[PDB]
RNA sequence: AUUGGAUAUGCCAUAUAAAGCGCUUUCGAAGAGUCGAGUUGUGCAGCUCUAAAUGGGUGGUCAUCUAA
RNA sequence: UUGACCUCAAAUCAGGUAGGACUACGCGCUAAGCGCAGGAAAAGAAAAUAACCAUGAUUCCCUCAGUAACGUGAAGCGGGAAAAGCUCAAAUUUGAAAUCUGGCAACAUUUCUUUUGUUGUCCGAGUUGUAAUUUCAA
């Protein structure tokens, strides 16, 4: 048994139209959803920066976007992960704010019932 | 110490019926099992039928359902 | 085989006159019925509309996670357990928690007669935890007999292996 | 007084909302050096003023730092019972409802597993008990205190005298001790207080005829509720041990057509001044308070006073009374009298008859069964009601274990006791 | 800028954190409810043929023998122990009462 | 409610109460079919927590097999096809003897509105849940073939991955 | 993008709610007996306050009356 | 000609409702012939025995998970 | 003598459903045999790693690495593709089984006179528990 890569550019391909294919769905909205910043976890990594899964409950609290609403606008909530150190927290803090700085939030259709 | 001795029956070589036993029921508690607060809903009105009064009357202003006295009347 | 004494407790039930007396208290707090109780939100449901308080009700609780419930709250002041459940494990326990909590119980004939009384068809346990003003003597001479002909009554052949 | 005080706009506004804009002598003394950031070893008397003087300076502390509840407690206040820690936390609500520092108070026989809860969110001013806040300082994880700045300790002879000499001692290490300001206070100067202020406090401090009725546990509300009814006509306080037991009972007492007055309020200092005003004022009426509210209070011409809940004070209580004095006294309580014949107290005995005993009992548990404010007033006063009988000074005396829980929730309305941890 | 750097560094000055402990954690701690429902249980279902022999084994003070059976039976001495402590207990509660 | 009382009565399985019960029930279970229909469960607290619900489209069916594959393994299988216009949900023991091992079997009646309307139970209508005692796709399925989360638990092996550019 | 989205937020701005008869009559009944301020009061009430509102929700439909 | 998800707008809307987050002098349930142990066959299965509640699992007293 | 419930039956009663074939790829039992699926399947929101400044469902690719381990032969980490989270059991709705299938009658609707629903009513299911609320991240 061989495993043959003669579809290589085929699956480059592929790959491109599905995102642009999930572009043209939500074209306003960026292709990707946000990530934390986190430090690698052993002793030759943990110099690094990599992206994460999601944010904790702590940086959304401390943010101000309710686990709720952090969803609906495309920030990933990590409940496993967890803040040891403050410079984790305020590293992760500060990328919920400048996100929510380039955020412009279309509103939506509200029911208003004519009666109380 | 330990004497590193043998047991009498170390391997190294009756009433199958009682009766009901009390030790724990023999003595009655007194005060209730949970201590979880109580809510308000037990002492008003039920939310269950106004939920269902307010879609009756919905459907008695849409004429979806015959009224009592709409209904008695048909009857005869 | 031999029965054990959780299990035997209940072939020694309430007699003939007692649970005769305690189903007729039972039948003056009823439940409310499938078919009258639309009847009565229709009637509240017609008054809302055209143009617009009430008072709690009385009625006799059943369903066995509810009424053991009440028996933990020591709220019940009568359990009436069917002696006929066909997995036993759901009841065989109710006497003993009963005397625990302090609530007076009794072991009477057939689920269908606790099943009528709640207009279902099988009822495994039901219990009194408030009765009308009215009724409160009634309720205290039925447990006083519940006491004395059930209570009283057996007591040892409940702890004595049955069979 | 306190305009002369340069405490904050929000501190300032409060204060005169919360009581008057004057200044005690015991407060004229103590302001000035805390504000300042020296350490102050006070000894007043009971009831002088000094919830307000440990207070003020150090909600100013918290305003001048600007501290968070992401920051952990940064104040401590060390109370001796629960009466007293919950009469400074009730004060201290009125002082910070204009500011931003969150306050919790942390007492024994209150829910730990939701203490904790509020702890990890940050308690910027906390009033604790030496018993449950060691347990919190040493078992709660998430609990940040390392910011801590400010130490207050209110009076140390009653902590030392309950029991907590060992408590105070584990509390110290754990507790941070470089740049904190401390604040001991208590009116005895007993060698083992120094010893704790040494141990506590920095170096250079600042210098500064009876009656009784014997009656069970299940008749005492309704021995008490005829005994007003009978004297409906005369100026009668009766004294309780429990700020939540005498919101109960004067709620109680008010639905079934016996208005009574109270010191409770809504936790309003400058209502309970009015109430106690007003009853001053009154040549005739009732009025329903705690031990610690009367404290401090000059008792007007009162022909009854009646000690509904035994004092937790017996040693301040006998020289507390020097018209006339009643005791509420169990049968399982008869040890008390023998403590007044060691302390040389003359006592006469009241005798009542089971026959004019009002039983309402029947009706009395049909309210509170039927109402929901009701029950859980209710509820709430029979819980403080024990925990301050747990936390009594004599054990030997007023043995809970010894009591009946049973014939006690009668008298509060419950046909059984409800379920109250400890 | 709304972007990411990933590799490099980050100041290596450290403040820890001391996080609250979580809801998954608390298992294993007993309820109210639960030790009554347990020991009311333990009374009502009655006990195994090796408990009883375990018990009759602690009442004519044949310990070592007790902690023998119970641990063959169970599979461990760490279960033994709580074995024998339990019906020792059931054994003083039942002597009250019997 | 009960449902508590009647999982700690379900651990003491030697005690009084549940030995003299094991032993009637395993009697009266020896004189019906191998296969056969229950009325309710036996154990409504073991059904209740794996997913039975007291509605129209459940159903509980009392399997015997010879104890001495996993015997609840093989009691899903052989219920399965016995009622094959049913989805298997899962399955508990209930009683054991010398001889037999009994077991009973939660099915759903993919069919039923009941069953086609509850979004809960939706999940089995779909054709992908057709036979998952035949698959190893049920609770004792999945164990069986060590299917779980950790380090206790073929095609990547043998191949030559040979890239475009190598 | 962004001019559009606070207008459309301008068009669809009104998110307070209008009372009804039922609730109207239920706030006015209780603050013809117990005034406009004493929301305690008004909660511990049983007779007037059948539903059992918190003085949070009476608070609510106190404000939300006005307009 | 069949339909996607949106947008504008009309008419209805059972809101006496349902949520998110502030607080707590109140509570906080967690899956058993399973886990585990002894022994055989190919972790799994058979057979014998068979649990616990700050417990149990898995790693280095600590950490970390929270099975059936 | 009647009725209620229970358990077991009968019907060419009404409405359904299963089988057999394909099988490149899937998942099982035991290359072959046997069983069962789909447009993918399986797996999947930790009884997971680690020992760090910690990480964070699953799957796949690269690397780790032909390394460790005992010729066999990985895995944590790291780089990437794609990213999405949730549902119950166990707590009384108890001031009200609030839940649901079916029959009948209307009405609407259609990839469709072929489909799919709504409202009303009646019986049945269900208190040996159907809804709402809750899932430890609470």
Redesign the interface.
């Known amino acids: ?6 579809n ?1 550019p085929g699956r480059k391909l592929r790959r491109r139209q599905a995102r642009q294919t999930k572009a043209a769905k939500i074209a ?1 909205r960026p292709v990707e959803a ?2 934390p ?1 986190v ?1 690698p976890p052993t002793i030759r990594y943990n ?5 994460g899964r999601g944010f904790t409950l702590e940086e959304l609290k ?1 943010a101000g976007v309710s686990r709720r609403v952090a969803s609906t606008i495309g920030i990933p909530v990590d409940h496993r992960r ?6 984790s ?1 305020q ?1 992760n803090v500060e ?1 919920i704010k ?2 929510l ?2 955020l ?4 939506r ?2 029911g ?1 019932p004519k ?2 | 110490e330990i004497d590193a001795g043998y047991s009498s029956d170390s391997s190294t070589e009756f009433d199958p019926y009682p009766d009901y036993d009390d030790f724990f029921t023999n003595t009655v508690r007194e005060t209730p099992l949970s201590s979880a607060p109580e809510p308000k809903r037990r002492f008003a009105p039920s939310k269950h039928e106004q939920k269902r009064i307010l879609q009756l009357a919905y459907a008695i202003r849409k004429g979806r359902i015959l009224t009592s006295e709409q209904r008695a009347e048909r009857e005869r | 085989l031999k029965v054990p004494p959780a299990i035997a407790q209940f072939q020694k039930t309430l007699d003939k006159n007692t649970a005769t007396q305690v189903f007729k208290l039972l039948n003056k707090y009823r439940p409310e019925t499938a078919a009258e109780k639309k009847q009565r939100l229709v009637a509240e449901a017609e008054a809302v509309a055209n143009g617009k308080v009430s008072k709690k009700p009385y009625n006799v609780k059943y369903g066995l996670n509810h009424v053991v419930a009440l028996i933990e709250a020591k709220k019940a002041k009568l359990v009436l357990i069917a002696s006929d459940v066909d997995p036993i494990e759901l009841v065989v326990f109710l006497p003993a928690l009963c005397k625990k909590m302090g609530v007076p119980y009794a072991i009477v004939k057939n689920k269908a007669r606790l099943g009528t009384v709640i207009h279902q068809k099988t009822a495994a346990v039901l219990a009194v935890t408030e009765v009308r003003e009215e009724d409160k003597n009634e309720l205290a001479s039925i447990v006083s007999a519940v006491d004395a002909n059930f209570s009283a009554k057996y007591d040892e052949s409940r702890r004595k292996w049955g069979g | 007084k306190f305009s002369d005080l340069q405490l904050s706009e929000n501190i300032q506004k409060a204060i005169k909302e919360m009581g008057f804009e004057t200044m005690t002598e015991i407060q004229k003394r103590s302001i000035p050096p805390l504000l300042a950031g020296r350490d102050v070893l006070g000894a007043a008397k009971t009831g002088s003023g000094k919830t307000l003087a440990f207070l003020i300076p150090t909600i100013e502390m918290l305003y001048a730092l600007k501290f968070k509840p992401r920051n952990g407690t940064g104040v401590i206040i060390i109370s001796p019972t629960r009466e007293l820690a919950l009469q400074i936390f009730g004060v201290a609500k009125e002082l910070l409802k204009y500011h931003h520092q969150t306050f919790g108070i942390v007492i024994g026989g209150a829910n730990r597993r939701a203490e904790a809860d509020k702890l990890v969110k940050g308690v910027n001013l906390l009033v604790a008990t030496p018993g449950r806040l060691l347990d919190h300082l040493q078992n709660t994880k998430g609990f940040v205190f390392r910011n801590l700045r400010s130490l207050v300790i209110d009076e140390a002879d009653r902590i030392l005298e309950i029991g907590f000499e060992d408590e105070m001692r584990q509390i110290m290490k754990i507790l941070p001790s470089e740049n904190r300001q401390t604040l001991l206070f208590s009116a005895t100067q007993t060698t083992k207080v120094e010893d704790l202020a040494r141990i506590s406090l920095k170096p250079g401090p600042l210098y500064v005829e009876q009656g009784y009725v014997v009656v069970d546990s299940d008749k005492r509300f309704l021995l008490l509720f005829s005994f007003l009814k009978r004297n409906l006509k005369k100026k009668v306080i009766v004294f309780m041990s429990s700020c939540a037991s005498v919101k109960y009972m004067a709620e109680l007492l008010n639905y079934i057509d016996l208005p009574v007055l109270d010191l409770h309020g809504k936790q309003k200092q400058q209502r309970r001044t009015n109430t106690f005003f007003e009853f001053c004022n009154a040549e005739k009426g009732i009025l329903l308070c705690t031990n610690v509210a009367a404290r401090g209070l000059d008792i007007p011409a009162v022909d009854w006073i009646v000690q509904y809940d035994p004092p937790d004070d017996p040693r301040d209580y006998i020289h507390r009374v020097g018209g006339k004095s009643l005791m509420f006294l169990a049968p399982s309580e008869l040890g008390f009298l023998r403590y007044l014949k060691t302390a040389k107290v003359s006592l006469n005995e009241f005798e009542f008859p089971a026959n004019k005993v009002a039983n309402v009992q029947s009706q009395l548990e049909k309210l509170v069964s039927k109402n929901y404010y009701l029950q859980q007033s209710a509820k709430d006063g029979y819980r403080s009601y024990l925990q301050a009988y747990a936390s009594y000074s004599l054990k030997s005396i007023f043995d809970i274990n010894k009591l009946d829980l049973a014939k006690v929730a009668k008298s509060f309305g419950f046909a059984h006791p409800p379920n109250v941890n400890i | 800028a709304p972007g990411l750097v990933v590799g490099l560094n980050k100041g290596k000055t450290l403040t820890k954190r001391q996080l609250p402990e979580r809801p998954s954690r608390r298992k294993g701690h007993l309820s109210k409810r639960t030790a009554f429902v347990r020991s009311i249980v333990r009374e009502v279902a009655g006990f195994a043929p090796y408990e009883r022999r375990v018990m009759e084994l602690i009442r004519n003070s044949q310990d070592k023998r007790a902690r023998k059976l119970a641990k063959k039976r169970l599979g461990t001495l760490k279960r033994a122990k709580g074995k024998i402590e339990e019906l020792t207990s059931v054994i003083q509660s039942s002597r009250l009462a019997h | 409610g009960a449902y508590k009382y009647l999982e700690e009565l379900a651990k003491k399985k030697q005690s009084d109460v549940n030995l003299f019960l094991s032993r009637v029930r395993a009697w009266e279970y020896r004189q019906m079919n191998v296969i056969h229909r229950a009325s309710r469960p036996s154990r409504p607290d073991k059904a209740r927590r794996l997913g039975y619900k007291a509605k129209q489209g459940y159903v509980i069916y009392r399997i015997r097999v010879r104890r001495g594959r996993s015997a609840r393994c093989t009691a899903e299988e052989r219920v399965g096809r016995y009622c094959s216009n049913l989805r298997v949900l899962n399955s508990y023991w209930v009683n054991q003897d010398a001889t037999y091992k009994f077991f009973e079997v939660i099915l759903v009646d993919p069919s039923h509105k009941a069953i086609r309307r509850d979004p809960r139970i939706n999940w089995i209508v779909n054709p992908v849940h057709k036979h998952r005692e035949s698959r190893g796709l049920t609770s004792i399925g999945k164990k069986s073939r060590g299917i779980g989360k950790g380090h206790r638990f073929w095609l990547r092996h043998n191949t030559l991955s040979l890239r475009r550019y190598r | 993008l962004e001019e559009e989205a606070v207008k459309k937020a301008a068009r669809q701005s009104n998110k307070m709610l209008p009372l009804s008869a039922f609730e109207h009559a239920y706030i006015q009944r209780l603050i013809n007996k117990y005034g406009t301020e004493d929301f305690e009061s008004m909660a511990k009430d049983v007779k007037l306050n059948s539903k059992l509102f918190n003085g949070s929700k009476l608070k609510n439909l106190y404000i939300r009356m006005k307009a």
């Open positions: 048994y061989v495993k043959t890569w003669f290589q306003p946000i990530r910043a430090k110099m690094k920066v990599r992206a401390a967890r803040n040891r150190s403050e410079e927290l590293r990328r400048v996100y700085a380039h412009i939030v279309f509103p259709k509200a208003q009666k109380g």
